[PDB]
RNA sequence: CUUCCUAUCAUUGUGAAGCAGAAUUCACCAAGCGUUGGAUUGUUCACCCACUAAUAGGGAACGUGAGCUGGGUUUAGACC
RNA sequence: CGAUGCCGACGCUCAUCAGACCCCAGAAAAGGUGUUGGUUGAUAUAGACAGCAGGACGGUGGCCAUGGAAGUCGGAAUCC
């Protein structure tokens, strides 16, 4: 037969080798595209997650029922000591892929 | 405000058409066969009904 | 079936020189040059006479659908003759019954912004094809003018701004407004 | 503008909430929240300041035994403002209203959540104290 | 063409030449259906008018057979739509009374304009109406001295210009035309003695 | 005249029906008059056989509705036991209303239509402009279309 | 609890009206995405109260009992 | 997959669902100025079909129906 009552699905199939990661740290899978007008600059950093804490700020979204009032907003604290550059790598485009 | 000539100029593009009774296409005013292959170039055509 | 020959001749004016590399007719007149590529169309083109008096197209052994292109090759060249000597003007009028169409030519010949159409707050901007210049008519209160030396780019670029102002979800035979082509002439005519 | 930032819905269908005005009712019996599209096998829930249909189960014989629109004033489930204070009153509450959005009675006892007073101005006219 | 229609065409023209003593070659140039009705209404009081599509061509087959001789002097002169009028009238009356009428016939849509009209800033006749039909193409005209007065005086009317559906209509109520030819005569047939208007 | 008696050259003419009895148009004299400030009052004066429809040309020289019954014979032939409905009188006459001589008056006054040779061609028109008995008794025009030369020069 | 179909209830793009606007009806490419909470009955089905953009129809051994429930059929006890 | 790796013969067909072999697992009534043949009647040098050159003409909303009908429910009628 058909399902008696319709229903939305559980979970998402777009994430479906649901298993332990081979890595331990994040592996950025696609870096932002370079607009060669801009002066050279890095793209990504490497930080450590410390904990969480509050914050209090104003807000100036025009039209919101929360305009020009306090809001409290849960935040993290990602401690980020300066890294150290040690090596350079060059990549060449190949019809197969990147080398 | 719309003028005499302009209205009949507008009626040329929106109001003087031939319609195909099997697929509801919008043919050019002197056609006796439809244009689309999803009804088979049928020749059952009627003028697009002009307003009151 | 299988007609042994059906040809056509293009008498071209004496102010024009036309050259053709096999099937890439290049026409040059008082206003500029035009290049058109007739490939995958299978017609042999010839050119006869001093000053290039006449262009002669040819077509051997052609069935019906393959025959009716001998004139189409001829007919486009006429538009490449006329478009380069005279130059096309496509006059087009703005019909409005709600309240004014506010068209302003933001640049030389492109970005034809169309405000207050049907009362909308959207600024419908349209970019003309290369080499087609749009000007708001000094001659009449509500007309644009598209001048260009190629019918396909001139005529298409008119259909955009006509089609880019379309009433939606309303009785079309009642909401008669927009921008609709009126006159299809030349730059110098008589 | 029309902001109604999510507040923890705490009265599912079946909630019996004390009436809070002088119409003479004493219990609203929620039947269905108004504006909820729902999912398979989930009771609709009515927050604070949400129009919700209700059938008076104890009070004036005129009112009982028919469906009257209602608005939930005070809810017992601790809901969060958008500044981190979790306000929660002492009892469930409500008030009869027309579907045009204006009261039937003319005297509300007890406080009114600030969420309602921002939404239904007619209720905020008669509110004793917008807590 | 048909057969009976063709034999009737043979029958109608052949009688009218015999019925009225002589017949004139009058130019029946482009003119309205009712506008050329009046051409037949004016010219008939004691005369017969006839327009022929294939009656007029028997001149060739007759000229070879030399009846009412020398039609070869008149066969290829009928380029353009000139015509015959079967009358008991004379050479000067046919010419002048058809000149006098000078029909301002209504034109056609999509035509060409070899003939021009000057457009002065005065009144020629424009009754109860709105200038908006002129305001369509940018011409703005005021109302004074009775009819609507077109204040423009520049040569709006040129040679070979395109005429739209509404364009001939404007010249109709102004009663001006880009085809102002009227009715023109220069050729006469008088019982075998060919003449020109006297 | 139409909106508010605009400043113009009004000499308007319209094709109006139903003289005498009102008919189902529920109007006799005006078609564009009353909104033009030109009263239909004087058009009603002419409105007051034929108990039946006509065609009326009405003239309005800026202030005056001078209604004129057109001199077309058919409009006058009819106007001169009750003439009840659903007839069907074959065709509209009694058979003895002297059709051949009502049309004498018309031939001498109708001079605004239908190209005329000698008056043997107006007689073709005004016997065919008729619809009372359709060209006295019921022989319709069938071979009477050549008399413009053989009964015109012998008409007077 | 998963998937699939389209002969489409709503959503994106569009065609037509006896289409002024609002609501609507006929149709096209179209299955990505949704199609509910309950009283009564074992119920599939049905009929109702309420909200909703709509509360469209179906298939997979009339899906699914070493997945459950056993309410009713359909053993043995009984009563009319 | 053994055999056309013949410089095989004449043709027909564009499919945004092509078609591809007895029993056989390839649907119809009906349509298509898609395309290629056939049959029949015409018209063209008393010259064609187009397009340029004029248009639904006027007495006339004929007379009537009155059901409102100047081309319209519908009328013996319905011509010049
Ligand atoms: Zn079709």
Curated annotation (Swiss-Prot), chain A:
- What residue spans carry the region label Disordered? 1-36
- UniProt feature, compositional bias: Basic residues: 17-30
Posttranslational modification: It is not required for incorporation of RPL3 into ribosomes.
Q: Which residues carry this modification: Phosphoserine?
A: 12
The listed locations are: Nucleus, Nucleolus; Cytoplasm
Q: Which domain of life is it from?
A: Eukaryota
The cross-link Glycyl lysine isopeptide (Lys-Gly) (interchain with G-Cter in SUMO2) sits at 38
Which family does the similarity line name?
A: Belongs to the universal ribosomal protein uL3 family.
In UniProt terms, what function does this protein have?
A: Component of the large ribosomal subunit. The ribosome is a large ribonucleoprotein complex responsible for the synthesis of proteins in the cell.
Q: How does it assemble?
A: Component of the large ribosomal subunit. Interacts with DHX33.
Protein's recorded name: Large ribosomal subunit protein uL3
UniProt source species: Oryctolagus cuniculus (Rabbit)
Q: Which gene encodes it?
A: RPL3
Q: Which residues of the whole protein does the chain here span?
A: 2 to 100 of 403
Curated annotation (Swiss-Prot), chain C:
Modified sites of kind N6-acetyllysine: 121
What protein am I looking at?
Large ribosomal subunit protein uL6
In terms of Gene3D superfamilies, this protein maps to: Ribosomal protein L6, alpha-beta domain
Coiled coil segments of this chain: none
Assembly information from the UniProt record:
Component of the large ribosomal subunit.
InterPro entries (UniProt xref): Ribosomal_uL6-like, Ribosomal_uL6-like_a/b-dom_sf, Ribosomal_uL6_a/b-dom, Ribosomal_uL6_CS2
Superkingdom of the source? Answer: Eukaryota
Instruction: Name the keywords, alphabetized.
Output: Acetylation, Cytoplasm, Ribonucleoprotein, Ribosomal protein
Q: What is its main location?
A: cytoplasm
GO biological process terms held by the UniProt record: cytoplasmic translation
Q: Which GO terms describe its cellular component?
A: cytosolic large ribosomal subunit
Species: Oryctolagus cuniculus (Rabbit)
Protein purpose: Component of the large ribosomal subunit. The ribosome is a large ribonucleoprotein complex responsible for the synthesis of proteins in the cell.
Q: Which family does it belong to?
A: Belongs to the universal ribosomal protein uL6 family.
Q: Does the keyword Manganese apply?
A: no
UniProtKB/Swiss-Prot annotation, chain E:
Q: Which residues carry this modification: Phosphotyrosine?
A: 20
Predominant cellular place of this UniProt entry's protein: nucleus
Any idea where this protein resides? Answer: Nucleus; Cytoplasm
Q: What are the recorded Gene Ontology BP terms?
A: cytoplasmic translation; ribosomal large subunit assembly
For this UniProt record, the keywords arranged alphabetically read as follows: Cytoplasm, Isopeptide bond, Nucleus, Phosphoprotein, Ribonucleoprotein, Ribosomal protein, Ubl conjugation
Named from the GO MF annotations, one term is: large ribosomal subunit rRNA binding
Has UniProt tagged this entry with the keyword NADP?
no
UniProt key word Ubl conjugation: yes
Q: Which residues carry this modification: Phosphothreonine?
A: 55
Query: GO CC annotations?
Result: cytoplasmic ribonucleoprotein granule; cytosolic large ribosomal subunit; endoplasmic reticulum; nucleus; postsynaptic density
Which branch of life, at top level?
Eukaryota
Query: Subunit comment for this entry?
Result: P0 forms a pentameric complex by interaction with dimers of P1 and P2. Identified in a IGF2BP1-dependent mRNP granule complex containing untranslated mRNAs. Interacts with APEX1. Interacts with FMR1 isoform 6.
**Of which family is this protein a member?**
Belongs to the universal ribosomal protein uL10 family.
Protein's job:
Ribosomal protein P0 is the functional equivalent of E.coli protein L10.
Name of the protein in its database record: Large ribosomal subunit protein uL10
Which species is this UniProt entry from? Oryctolagus cuniculus
Parent-protein residues present: 5 to 202 of 318
From Swiss-Prot, chain F:
**GO MF:** large ribosomal subunit rRNA binding; structural constituent of ribosome
What GO biological process terms are annotated to this protein in UniProt? translation
Q: Posttranslational modification, per the record? A: Ubiquitinated at Lys-48 and Lys-78 by RNF14 and RNF25 in response to ribosome collisions (ribosome stalling).
Q: Tell me which Gene3D superfamilies the record gives.
A: Ribosomal protein L11, C-terminal domain, Ribosomal protein L11/L12, N-terminal domain
Cross-link type Glycyl lysine isopeptide (Lys-Gly) (interchain with G-Cter in ubiquitin), placed at 48, 78
GO cellular component entries: cytosolic large ribosomal subunit
Which parts of the sequence carry N6-acetyllysine?
A: 49
Q: What InterPro entries does UniProt report for this protein, alphabetically?
A: Ribosomal_uL11, Ribosomal_uL11_C, Ribosomal_uL11_C_sf, Ribosomal_uL11_CS, Ribosomal_uL11_N, Ribosomal_uL11_N_sf
Q: What is its main location?
A: cytoplasm
Q: Which SUPFAM superfamilies match?
A: Ribosomal L11/L12e N-terminal domain, Ribosomal protein L11, C-terminal domain
| Crosslinked residue numbers (Glycyl lysine isopeptide (Lys-Gly) (interchain with G-Cter in SUMO2)) | 40
Location of Phosphoserine modifications:
38
Could you describe the subunit structure of this protein? Component of the large ribosomal subunit. Mature ribosomes consist of a small (40S) and a large (60S) subunit. The 40S subunit contains about 33 different proteins and 1 molecule of RNA (18S). The 60S subunit contains about 49 different proteins and 3 molecules of RNA (28S, 5.8S and 5S).
**UniProt similarity note:** Belongs to the universal ribosomal protein uL11 family.
Q: What does this protein do?
A: Component of the large ribosomal subunit. The ribosome is a large ribonucleoprotein complex responsible for the synthesis of proteins in the cell. Binds directly to 26S ribosomal RNA.
Q: What is this protein called?
A: Large ribosomal subunit protein uL11
């Amino acid at each position: 037969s058909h399902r008696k009552f319709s229903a939305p699905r559980h979970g998402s199939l777009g994430f479906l080798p649901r298993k332990r990661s081979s890595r331990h740290r994040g592996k950025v899978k696609s870096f932002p595209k370079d607009d060669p007008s801009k002066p050279v600059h890095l793209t990504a950093f490497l930080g450590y997650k410390a904990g969480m804490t509050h914050i209090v700020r104003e807000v100036d979204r025009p039209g919101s029922k929360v305009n020009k009032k306090e809001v409290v907003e849960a935040v993290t604290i990602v401690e980020t000591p300066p890294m150290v550059v040690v090596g350079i790598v060059g990549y060449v485009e190949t019809p197969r892929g990147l080398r | 405000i719309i003028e005499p000539s302009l209205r009949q100029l507008a009626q040329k593009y929106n109001c003087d058409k031939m319609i195909c009774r099997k697929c509801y296409a919008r043919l050019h005013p002197r056609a006796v066969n439809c244009r689309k292959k999803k009804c088979g170039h049928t020749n059952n055509l009627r003028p697009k009904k002009k307003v009151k | 079936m299988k007609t042994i020959l059906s040809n056509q001749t293009v008498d071209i004016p004496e102010n024009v020189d036309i050259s053709l590399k096999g099937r890439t007719v290049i026409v040059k007149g008082p206003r500029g040059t035009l290049r058109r590529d007739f490939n995958h169309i299978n017609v042999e083109l010839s050119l006869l006479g001093k000053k290039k008096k006449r262009l002669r197209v040819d077509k051997w052994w052609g069935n019906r659908k393959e025959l009716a292109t001998v004139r189409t090759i001829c007919s486009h060249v006429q538009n490449m003759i006329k478009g380069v000597t005279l130059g096309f003007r496509y006059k087009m009028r703005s019909v409005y019954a709600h309240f004014p169409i506010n068209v302003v030519i933001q640049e030389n010949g492109s970005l034809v912004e169309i405000r207050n159409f049907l009362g909308e707050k959207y600024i419908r901007r349209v970019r003309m094809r290369p080499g087609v210049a749009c000007s708001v008519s000094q001659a009449q209160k509500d007309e644009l003018v598209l001048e260009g030396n190629d019918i396909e780019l001139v005529s298409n670029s008119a259909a955009l701004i006509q089609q880019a102002t379309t009433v939606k979800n309303k009785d079309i035979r009642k909401f008669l407004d927009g921008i609709y082509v009126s006159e299809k002439g030349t730059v110098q005519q008589a | 503008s029309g902001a109604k930032f999510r507040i923890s819905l705490g009265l599912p269908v079946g909630a019996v909430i004390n009436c809070a005005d002088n119409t003479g009712a004493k219990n609203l019996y929620i039947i269905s929240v108004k504006g909820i599209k729902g999912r398979l096998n989930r009771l609709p829930a009515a927050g604070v300041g949400d129009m919700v249909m209700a059938t008076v189960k104890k009070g004036k014989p005129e009112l009982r035994k028919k469906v009257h629109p209602a608005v939930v004033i005070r809810q017992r489930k601790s809901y969060r403002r958008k500044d981190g204070v979790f306000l929660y009153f002492e009892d469930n509450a409500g008030v009869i209203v027309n579907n045009k959005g204006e009261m039937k009675g003319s005297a509300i006892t007890g406080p009114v959540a600030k969420e309602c007073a921002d939404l239904w101005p007619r209720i905020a006219s008669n509110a004793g104290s917008i807590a | 063409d048909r057969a009976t229609w063709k034999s009737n065409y043979f029958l109608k023209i052949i009688q009218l030449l015999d019925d009225y003593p002589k017949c004139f070659i009058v130019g029946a140039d482009n003119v309205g259906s009712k506008q050329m009705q009046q051409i037949r209404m004016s010219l008939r009081g004691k005369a017969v008018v006839l327009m022929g599509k294939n009656t007029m061509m028997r001149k060739a087959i007759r000229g070879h057979l030399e009846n009412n001789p020398a039609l070869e002097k008149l066969l290829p002169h009928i380029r353009g739509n000139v015509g015959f009028v079967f009358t008991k009238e004379d050479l000067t009356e046919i010419r002048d009374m058809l000149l006098a009428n000078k029909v301002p016939a209504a034109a056609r849509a999509g035509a060409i304009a070899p003939c021009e009209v000057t457009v002065p800033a005065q009144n020629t006749g424009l009754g109860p109406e709105k200038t908006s039909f002129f305001q369509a193409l940018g011409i703005t005209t005021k109302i004074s001295r009775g009819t609507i007065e077109i204040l423009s005086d520049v040569q709006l009317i040129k040679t070979g210009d395109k005429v739209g559906a509404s364009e001939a209509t404007l010249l109709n109520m102004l009663n001006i035309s880009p085809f102002s030819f009227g009715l023109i005569i220069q050729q006469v047939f008088d019982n075998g003695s060919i003449y020109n208007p006297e | 005249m139409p909106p508010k008696f605009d400043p113009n050259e009004i000499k308007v003419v319209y094709l109006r029906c139903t003289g005498g009895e009102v008919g189902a148009t529920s109007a006799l004299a005006p078609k564009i008059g009353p909104l033009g400030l030109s009263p239909k009052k004087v058009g009603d004066d002419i409105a007051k056989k034929g108990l039946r429809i006509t065609v009326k040309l009405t003239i309005q020289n800026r202030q005056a509705q001078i209604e004129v019954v057109p001199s077309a014979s058919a409009l006058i032939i009819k106007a001169l036991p009750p003439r009840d409905r659903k007839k069907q009188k074959n065709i509209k006459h009694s058979g003895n209303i002297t059709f051949d001589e009502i049309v004498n008056i018309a031939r001498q006054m109708r001079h605004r239509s239908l190209a005329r040779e000698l008056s043997g061609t107006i007689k073709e028109i005004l016997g065919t402009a008729q619809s009372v008995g359709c060209n006295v008794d019921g022989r319709h025009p069938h071979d009477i279309i050549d008399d413009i030369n053989s009964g015109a020069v012998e008409c007077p």
